[PDB]
Amino acid sequence: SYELTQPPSVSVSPGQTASITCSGDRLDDKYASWYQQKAGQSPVLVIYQDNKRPSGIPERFSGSNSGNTATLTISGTQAMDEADYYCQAWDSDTYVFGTGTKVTVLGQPKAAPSVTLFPPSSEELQANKATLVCLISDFYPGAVTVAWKADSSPVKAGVETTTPSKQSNNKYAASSYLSLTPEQWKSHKSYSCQVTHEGSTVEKTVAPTE
Amino acid sequence: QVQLVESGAEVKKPGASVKVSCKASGYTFTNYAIHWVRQAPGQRLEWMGWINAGRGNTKYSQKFQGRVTITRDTSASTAYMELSSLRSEDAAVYFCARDESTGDYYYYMDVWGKGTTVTVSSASTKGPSVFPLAPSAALGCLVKDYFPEPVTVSWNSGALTSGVHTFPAVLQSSGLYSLSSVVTVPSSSLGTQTYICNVNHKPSNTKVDKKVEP
C-alpha cells in the first residue's frame, strides 16, 4: 500500500528547532496531519490540514506540505516536547500513519550510569536456578547498551534487558538479566555486565567465589 | 468533554478472537466516525478501520485480510472491534480515536482513547518465584517466570516509597515474564531496618512477602 516515510530519529537541545519530515507519493495533493505521542500516552493531534493547529496545542508546532514532503517544525523545542511524532495522510480509502520519528530533547547534562550487579541468591540456587541481575541507574540521556561476558567471551544466550525508564529524579534506569543454570554459573571464573553510554563503557563483575 | 474509553486488557490464546469496545461520551455519537488503531510494542501506529457511527458503514485496512469487524451500538454510544484468528503479531495496544467527521472529508483524527492491551500467547497462568537481591546501598526483589501481566510490588506493605524503582517486565523467549524491584537505602539502616518486598500476582492468586537481608 501507500507508504509515508519518516526519519527514525531527531536529537535536539532545548531551544533548537526540530524538523521532522514525511515523504509520500503525491503528498502535495493530500492533507497531512501530525500526532505527538509521549512515552506511555495516547497520541495527540498537533497539526491537521497541513498547517492548522488545534486549540491548546503550543504555537511552536507548525506544519507545511510542499514538494511531496510534509514537515513538522518545532521552534524553540522544550524538554516536554520529547515524544514520538507520526505523520498521517489518506490514500485509496485508507488512513496511513508514517513510520514515526523519535524526538529526543537533551534536557539534562550527560550523566554516566551507576551499575550494580547482583549474583544469584542462595535461595535461587537452591531452587536449581541462577539469574544475574544488572541494575543501571541515574544516567542521561536515556539510551544505553548492555553486553554480558562470561570470563572474556560475549554472552549471546539468556539475556533480557528492559527499555530505560525515568526514575523520580528524571534520570533513567535500566535492567538486564542473564538467566543461567547453576552449573553454568559455578563453572566460570567471572561474569561481567558492560554498559555503554555515549561511547563510554562502565563494567561490573561478580564471581561464584565471592 | 469529548472522551473515548476502551474496555480492559485482554489475554488470549493464538487462534482465539477478541472484542474490544470503545465507549464515547461528551458529543453526539451519531455525527462522527470511530477509528481503530493498533500499536505493537515499540512500533508505529497502524490504522485498522473506521465505522460511521450514524449510518453504520465501515472501511477496513486491507492489511488485515478480513479479520477485522467493526460495529457500533448507537444507544450505548459504543463502537466495537472484533479481531478473529489472533496470532502473536496481534499482541498490541489498541486505540479508538474519533474522526474529524465521518471518515470522508479532511481525513484526520481529533480525539484518542486511552488504549487497551491485548496479549496473545500460548502461555498458561503461572505464579512467580520471588527471590531476594541482597544488599552489597541497593537491594531488591526478582520476580521470575510468571504469566500473564501484571505483578505489583510494594515494600514494607507500602510504608517504604522513596528510592523504590520497580522496573517494567521483560518477556522472555519462554513466553514468561520477569521483573525486578529495587530500593536504594542508607547503609546505616542495614541490619536494623527490616526490608520486605510484597509481591502480588492476582491471576495466580500468588502473594509472597520476602525479607531481603544483607
Residue numbers in the entry:
A (entry chain B): 1 to 9, 11 to 106, 106A, 107 to 210
B (entry chain A): 1 to 52, 52A, 53 to 82, 82A, 82B, 82C, 83 to 100, 100A, ...
Please share excerpts from the published article on this structure.
The HCMV Pentamer, composed of gH, gL, UL128, UL130, and UL131A, enhances entry into epithelial, endothelial, and myeloid cells by interacting with the cell surface receptor neuropilin 2 (NRP2). The other critical tropism-determining complex is the HCMV Pentamer, which is composed of glycoproteins UL128, UL130, and UL131A and the same gH and gL proteins that comprise the bulk of the HCMV Trimer. This elongated heteropentamer mediates tropism for endothelial and epithelial cells by binding to neuropilin 2 (NRP2) and triggering the viral fusion protein, gB, to facilitate entry into host cells. HCMV-directed antibodies isolated from asymptomatic donors predominantly target the Pentamer, suggesting that Pentamer-specific antibodies may restrict viral dissemination, making Pentamer a target for the development of vaccines and immunotherapeutics.
